Design a protein around this ligand. Structure first.
Ligand SMILES: [Ag+]
Ligand SMILES: [Ag+]
Length: 68
């Protein structure tokens, strides 16, 4: 399954739950949240576009980094 990596401007520890919540609501995802590197990696059949839009529902700055 594709593994898409995103920069997410996660500024505090609460952002692990925040990101977990929006991704869980989308569903069909397994992820790893790297708070120190402000990066989220998502294993999914969802498009880069669907994942980008989903992460942006947090209200944060999100950019696509590429594949893991
Ligand atoms: Ag936060
Ligand atoms: Ag947050």
């Amino acid at each position: 399954m594709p593994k898409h990596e995103f920069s997410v401007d996660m500024t505090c520890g609460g952002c692990a739950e925040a990101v977990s919540r929006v991704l869980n609501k989308l569903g069909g995802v397994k992820y790893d949240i790297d708070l120190p590197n402000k990066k989220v990696c998502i294993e999914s059949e969802h498009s880069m576009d669907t994942l980008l839009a989903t992460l942006k529902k947090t209200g944060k700055t999100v950019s696509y980094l590429g594949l893991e």
